[PDB]
Write a protein that binds this ligand. Structure first.
Ligand SMILES: [Mg+2]
Ligand SMILES: [Mg+2]
Ligand SMILES: [Mg+2]
Ligand SMILES: [Mg+2]
Ligand SMILES: [Mg+2]
Ligand SMILES: [Mg+2]
Ligand SMILES: [Mg+2]
Ligand SMILES: [Mg+2]
Ligand SMILES: [Mg+2]
Ligand SMILES: [Mg+2]
Ligand SMILES: [Mg+2]
Ligand SMILES: [Mg+2]
Ligand SMILES: [Mg+2]
Ligand SMILES: [Mg+2]
Ligand SMILES: [Mg+2]
Ligand SMILES: [Mg+2]
Ligand SMILES: [Mg+2]
Ligand SMILES: [Mg+2]
Ligand SMILES: [Mg+2]
Ligand SMILES: [Mg+2]
Ligand SMILES: [Mg+2]
Ligand SMILES: [Mg+2]
Ligand SMILES: [Mg+2]
Ligand SMILES: [Mg+2]
Ligand SMILES: [Mg+2]
Ligand SMILES: [Mg+2]
Ligand SMILES: [Mg+2]
Ligand SMILES: [Mg+2]
Ligand SMILES: [Mg+2]
Ligand SMILES: [Mg+2]
Ligand SMILES: [Mg+2]
Ligand SMILES: [Mg+2]
Ligand SMILES: [Mg+2]
Ligand SMILES: [Mg+2]
Ligand SMILES: [Mg+2]
Ligand SMILES: [Mg+2]
Ligand SMILES: [Mg+2]
Ligand SMILES: [Mg+2]
Ligand SMILES: [Mg+2]
Ligand SMILES: [Mg+2]
Ligand SMILES: [Mg+2]
Lengths: 63, 386, 183, 109
RNA sequence: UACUGAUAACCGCAGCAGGUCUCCAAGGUGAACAGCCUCUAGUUGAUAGAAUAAUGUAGAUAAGGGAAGUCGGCAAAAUAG
RNA sequence: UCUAGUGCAGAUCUUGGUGGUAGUAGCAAAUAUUCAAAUGAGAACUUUGAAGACUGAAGUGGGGAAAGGUUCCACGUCAACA
RNA sequence: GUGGAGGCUCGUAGCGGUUCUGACGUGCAAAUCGAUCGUCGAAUUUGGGUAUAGGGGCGAAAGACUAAUCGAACCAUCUAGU
RNA sequence: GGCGAGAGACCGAUAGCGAACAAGUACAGUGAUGGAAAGAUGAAAAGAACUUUGAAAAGAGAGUGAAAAAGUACGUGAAAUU
């Protein structure tokens, strides 16, 4: 399959970059039918697309 | 025009072509001249180079500054398990050279030697000398008349011997086989000696003795394709040389409009067969013996083998020859030891050598110790010990 | 249609061809000559082994400044290579010919490659950009491949020409005299 | 042929990656593990777990562990059978240190 | 009025290591939008695999001597805040 | 019989086509890729996930002027190009 | 002590282009790549607009530059010039 | 030169106007300007229904045609070269 545009739409919808957007690999058929931002939003609600955990940059040694 | 400044040829032209040797075992291209008076003996022997080590000895050279003083010298060790005599063959003279007329073999050939006649031994009926061995068992018919033919003819006689490779730590399993000339007298006695020694073993103590000068004949260490600089010892061109400095700059004049054979060119370095002469034997040591590495002055029971073993070879559980200096070949290589061809008195080939000490410290590093007991005494008890 | 030169029975033969194939002419020629005259199953097994690098294709003509290997000993050469693309095209055509033979109703086990010829197809040309603002060609040299498999027949025939003989009267008399004195 | 067995092995990668380019260490570790499995099990079809890939790449390219404890499981093939009816699945084994351990068969439990 | 604004959307015969005006600009080290590391964001592109001969290109190290080298201390080293 | 734009081996001749060279030179700057699954006839290169890395805010980021002109987006899709 | 001048100075961005007479030299490139270098607040660098056109321009002057063309550009014609 | 006509011991697709064809076209150049290549299946598309191998292109058969030694890479089909 091809989910480039789905990842792009999901980034724009979630407010993050594609490097954060996580598409589950077990619902590829459910994600490829997503052609619209509204469906991307549905999939973000139901947990098929989740934003991500931000990668930490601790200031502890600095402090 | 003429060379501005004189210098000698880089390299020796009588060691050409610097090509790979046709085999890994160098062949003896000359044996000692025969005196038909002395007993029957081999003129050569087969062994495997184990490594090098360090010797101390008191020098006897009247006129030197180190007379009756201790010197340190490098020796090389050759593991010489006893050879096994399987066969002889007679050579007769012709106006086109010496020519073999017959080769008689022993009845029973061992596996390690009949592996020399196979390139794939794991898949074979092994079918070797299986009819020649049935040529025996009728009393002597097809064998004694061949021996009588060698007696009636054959100004020169050579015995076929093979190595007991299974007694070495090498994992080769295939014995080396070689022709070695006999230099006694009475070709009849030569071939009778051979017949008596068929299937039987010959030790290096019956061939070589201490303080004797010998030649080592071996194929030397291979180094592959090498450039003219290390192959011939030519000058490095200066730093700001376009298209390489590790070269010969001029490889000939305009005329003759050719590259001459005497011009240094890149190519194979190493794996040439070499004969190195006048290497004194410093010890002939037995393998039915501990304290092989002991002397009259040390008297601590230690074998010749270093701690940890000879690097890349192993142990010297068999007999051995400790011969002065450096001989061609690397460790694990088959070496052909040969008696000298001329009588060298020289006031240095006659020096009786009495060893004082033998280095048996590890060659896998900067060995501090010669024996594990010495190690244990110096270091004390360790966490491994109880 | 209009294959190359054949000496075979078209009734006991089957054919295949592939035109305008983008595959090296020089490698396909060697690959074809590697199986010319071969039994068909043996050839297919051989080509699978070439792909698996267990056997090689000998390069006889288009071989200048290529490498050496031990897998040439099988053929009496040192220069041999493993042309994957050419092998795959050739064994596709062999599959085609074998299917055509099965449709014609042939034994399917007496089949051998009786004809296989590769000839050049029109070049497919692109540009190379060189130094100092220059343009060279970058051409693919494609191939037409045709092959014909044939059933193997036993010994063909005998009974050559009548071999008429003309004798002089002297030779006839010599023959008569010998036949008189001998039997 | 027979023997669908599973075993636990230790591979010494320090001697297999000796002298290797630093940006090719871990990649060659992958290939040497495949060659290890083909040696021990006779399988040219060797599938590695991504957990093993993570274990190999945990310290980057030039930080591959000197030793690695592997669970190699020879299995019967599926997938519209290919040339070979067997394949070897290589997983990692979670253990404090892979030093001191020798090969052991694993039971079908 | 979309879009690129450039190691692929412009010009260089081309999906060319070249050229081509400008805005925003995190944490640490540190004098410092220096160099080095990291977060946000973005890439993971450039034909690959196997070996490690010579000769190269680029990087380096060398006992003792210390410019004897060379047209010439070229190059490199040494020094360095 | 008349008539001429009438006869080629060359002219670093013109145009077109084809060779040997040769499956050769080479396809090496810009730190670096790996594992699995899905798709598919087919995957070193597509997609996703996992990992390992880089640009390191005078960026391989986000925007623009000139220039380009639809390269934007989608669907289908691989004969040529990459 | 304060103060903070300078066609001052070390040194980035940038502008330039010393030396390796390095790489390349049928190149990444019909002038590039790398390192080493000059300079870096001004006679600085630079976009856009405008003016100057061929025996003419422009020139801190090298006969330099004037669209890969310069000790007289490019295009066509005289011209199938001799 | 334009419009309209008739002729030729003219040329016959590298010829003849540059152009027998979507030619002053495509394309190049900032621009003035420069400026190609490229005709022919067969009487008629009757331009290959259908089977089979193959992922497909295609192939093998079959079939159309007077001829596929005419298959939109199409009249004849030279040589170099293979
Ligand atoms: Mg002289
Ligand atoms: Mg001279
Ligand atoms: Mg030497
Ligand atoms: Mg130079
Ligand atoms: Mg040592
Ligand atoms: Mg050659
Ligand atoms: Mg070559
Ligand atoms: Mg190029
Ligand atoms: Mg260019
Ligand atoms: Mg190394
Ligand atoms: Mg808008
Ligand atoms: Mg917009
Ligand atoms: Mg935009
Ligand atoms: Mg910009
Ligand atoms: Mg931008
Ligand atoms: Mg462009
Ligand atoms: Mg242009
Ligand atoms: Mg600070
Ligand atoms: Mg700023
Ligand atoms: Mg900083
Ligand atoms: Mg490249
Ligand atoms: Mg001098
Ligand atoms: Mg004429
Ligand atoms: Mg001609
Ligand atoms: Mg002429
Ligand atoms: Mg010409
Ligand atoms: Mg090549
Ligand atoms: Mg190159
Ligand atoms: Mg797009
Ligand atoms: Mg600067
Ligand atoms: Mg420069
Ligand atoms: Mg230069
Ligand atoms: Mg060059
Ligand atoms: Mg201004
Ligand atoms: Mg002047
Ligand atoms: Mg100019
Ligand atoms: Mg004229
Ligand atoms: Mg006809
Ligand atoms: Mg016709
Ligand atoms: Mg035709
Ligand atoms: Mg011809």
């Amino acid at each position: 399959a091809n989910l480039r545009t789905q990842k792009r739409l999901a980034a724009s919808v979630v407010g993050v970059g594609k490097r954060k957007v996580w598409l589950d690999p077990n619902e590829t058929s459910e994600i490829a039918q997503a052609n619209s931002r509204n469906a991307i939003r549905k999939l973000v609600k139901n947990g098929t697309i989740v934003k991500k955990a931000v990668t930490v940059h601790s200031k502890s040694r600095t402090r | 025009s003429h060379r501005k400044y004189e210098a000698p040829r880089h390299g020796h032209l009588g060691f050409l072509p610097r090509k790979r040797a046709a085999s890994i075992r160098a062949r003896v291209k000359a044996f000692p001249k025969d005196d038909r008076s002395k007993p029957v003996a081999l003129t050569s022997f087969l062994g495997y180079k184990a490594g090098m080590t360090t010797i101390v000895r008191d020098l006897d050279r009247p006129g030197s500054k180190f007379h009756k003083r201790e010197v340190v010298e490098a020796v090389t060790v050759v593991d010489t398990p006893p050879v096994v005599v399987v066969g002889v063959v007679g050579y007769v003279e012709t106006p086109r050279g010496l020519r073999s007329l017959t080769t008689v073999w022993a009845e029973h050939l061992s596996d390690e030697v009949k592996r020399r006649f196979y390139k794939n031994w794991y898949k074979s009926k092994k079918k070797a000398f299986t009819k020649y061995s049935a040529k025996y068992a009728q009393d002597g018919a097809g064998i004694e008349r061949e021996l009588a033919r060698i007696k009636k003819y054959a100004s020169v006689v050579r015995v076929l011997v093979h190595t007991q490779i299974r007694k070495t730590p090498l994992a080769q399993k295939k014995a080396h086989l070689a022709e070695i000339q006999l230099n006694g007298g009475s070709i009849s006695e030569k071939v009778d000696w051979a017949r008596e020694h068929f299937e039987k073993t010959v030790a290096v103590d019956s061939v070589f003795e201490q303080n004797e000068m010998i030649d080592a004949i071996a194929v030397t260490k291979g180094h592959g394709f090498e450039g003219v600089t290390h192959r011939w010892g030519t000058k490095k061109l200066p730093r700001k040389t376009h298209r390489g400095l590790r070269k010969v700059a001029c490889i000939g004049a305009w005329h003759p409009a050719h590259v001459m054979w005497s011009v240094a060119r890149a190519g194979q370095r190493g794996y040439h067969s070499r004969t190195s002469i006048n290497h004194k034997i410093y010890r002939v040591g037995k393998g039915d013996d501990e304290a092989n590495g002991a002397t009259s002055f040390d008297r601590t029971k230690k074998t010749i083998t270093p701690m940890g073993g000879f690097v890349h070879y192993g142990e010297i559980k068999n007999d051995f020859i400790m011969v002065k200096g450096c001989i061609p070949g690397n460790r694990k290589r088959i070496v052909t030891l040969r008696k000298s061809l001329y009588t060298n008195t020289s006031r240095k080939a006659l020096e009786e050598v009495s060893l004082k000490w033998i280095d048996t410290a590890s060659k896998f590093g900067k060995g501090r110790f010669q024996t594990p007991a010495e190690k244990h005494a110096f270091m004390g008890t360790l966490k491994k010990d109880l | 249609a209009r294959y190359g030169a054949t000496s075979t029975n078209p009734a006991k033969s089957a054919s295949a061809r592939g035109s305008y194939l983008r595959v090296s002419f020089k490698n396909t020629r060697e690959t074809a000559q590697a199986i010319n005259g071969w039994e068909l199953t043996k050839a297919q097994k051989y080509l699978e082994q070439v792909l698996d690098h267990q056997r090689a294709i000998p390069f006889r003509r288009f071989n200048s400044s290529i490498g050496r290997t031990a897998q040439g000993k099988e053929f009496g050469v040192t220069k041999a290579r493993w042309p994957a693309k050419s092998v795959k095209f050739v064994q596709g055509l062999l599959q085609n010919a074998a299917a055509n033979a099965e449709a014609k109703g042939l034994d399917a086990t007496k089949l051998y490659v009786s004809h296989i010829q590769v000839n050049q197809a029109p070049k497919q040309r692109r540009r190379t950009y060189r130094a100092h603002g220059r343009i060279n060609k970058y051409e693919s040299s494609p191939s037409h491949i045709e092959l014909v498999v044939t059933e193997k027949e036993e010994a063909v025939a005998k009974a050559a020409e009548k071999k008429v003989v003309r004798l002089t009267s002297r030779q006839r008399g010599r023959i008569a005299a010998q036949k008189r004195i001998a039997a | 042929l027979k023997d669908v067995v599973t075993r636990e092995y230790t591979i010494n990668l320090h001697k297999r990656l000796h002298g290797v380019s630093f940006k090719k260490r871990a990649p060659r570790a992958v290939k040497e593990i495949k060659k290890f499995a083909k040696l021990h099990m006779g399988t040219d079809d060797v599938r590695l777990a991504p957990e093993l890939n993570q274990a190999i790449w945990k310290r980057g390219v030039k930080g591959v562990e000197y030793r690695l404890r592997l669970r190699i499981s020879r299995k019967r093939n599926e997938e519209e059978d290919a040339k070979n009816p067997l394949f070897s699945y290589v997983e990692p084994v979670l253990v404090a240190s892979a030093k001191g351990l020798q090969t052991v068969v694993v039971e079908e439990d």
